[PDB]
Design an enzyme around this catalytic site. Sequence first.
Site: not given
Lengths: 149, 149, 149
Positions: C10, C50, C112, C115, C126
């Site tokens: 990310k 998402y 965080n 992913h 994905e």
Amino acid sequence: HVEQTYLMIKPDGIQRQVVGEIISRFEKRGYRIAAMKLTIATPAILEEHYAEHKGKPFLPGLIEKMTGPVLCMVFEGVDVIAQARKMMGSTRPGEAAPGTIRADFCQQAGRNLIHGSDSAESAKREISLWFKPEEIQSYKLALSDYIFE
Amino acid sequence: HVEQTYLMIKPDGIQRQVVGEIISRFEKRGYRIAAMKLTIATPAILEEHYAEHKGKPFLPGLIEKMTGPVLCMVFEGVDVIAQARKMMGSTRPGEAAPGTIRADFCQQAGRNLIHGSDSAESAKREISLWFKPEEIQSYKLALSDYIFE
Amino acid sequence: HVEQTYLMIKPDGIQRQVVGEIISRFEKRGYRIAAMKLTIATPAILEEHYAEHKGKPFLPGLIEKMTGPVLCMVFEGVDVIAQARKMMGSTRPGEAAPGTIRADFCQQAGRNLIHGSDSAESAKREISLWFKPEEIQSYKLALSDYIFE
């Protein structure tokens, strides 16, 4: 009271060239290298090491994978037999806890990098099998006062 | 919202020369160094630090082991009091989770490398004991936007 | 039998400049890099990524935080989908286990670092969303005999 355990880097640890990293993990806790020897494991000695598995169908393939260079080691420390097992993690790397050797380095039990004695009885037997008593060295770590209570 | 915890490298951490490694573990999470001071801990200040143990039989030996160089530190971050305790691991290194400071570096509770506040109340009291308010530095981490929600 | 998972660094992982450290954690287990691409994620792709969160109150802010540079990756290994999730740790870094990426690097769920696909179905979806088939590279690791059973 300290004890001694038998730890052995398997041929995958040698061939993946992570010997120094493995040793550093044990040195980091102030465990003392009491013995160390590079050898090539052969079927006759592996059959003694894995005596508990004699006659089991998985044994021949296990011996073939273990036939290669290994680093025999004895480390000394408080509770070191159980602690080294905890540091290795589960036999199956996918089940091993994060931060253990098997979880950090490995994928499958058949290539799980390292062996460690599972009990005081096994440590005595394994140390005797892979080392002469003379190859165990007696010396004191200079940082002992800051490692031990 | 962030909080501040008191973390202190004990004499074994100084003497084993792992100060930078310890600091790096906290910096790695984006925790901010708000205060830092090397001192030599003496019995009078240690009696105050360990006031919860006044009169207990183990206290004199505990103070003796802590009489030596220490690194006093304050780190700031989200939930940092509890998180730092989680990173330290159990007081007994043999029970501490793999990947914690105590499990990675130590063998016995009497030489377990690091102290950290156990509550908001202990953090406030300990920071005040070891630092003057003028020693606590306020600045913003440049990467704050990528650390905090 | 190996599988492939989609892992994405990310924008916080890019900006904190820990890309190499993240990659090294997966390489360390003998996971194979099957695909890798730096891009700037767009809302159009992120909305599909998402899709499970369509219409939820938090989705717009989630997309905004992810609109920036990302490193798209595919890793291959035994059980790598579940294993990568285990290595990442819980969504909330404060709940993640010691030695996981989120526990070692992060403070809050909104930053965080990484992913990873959560299932076989989501990995396939994905990988196809972020990579064309021609970008997926098939080769064998030279140390395969020392990684796989």
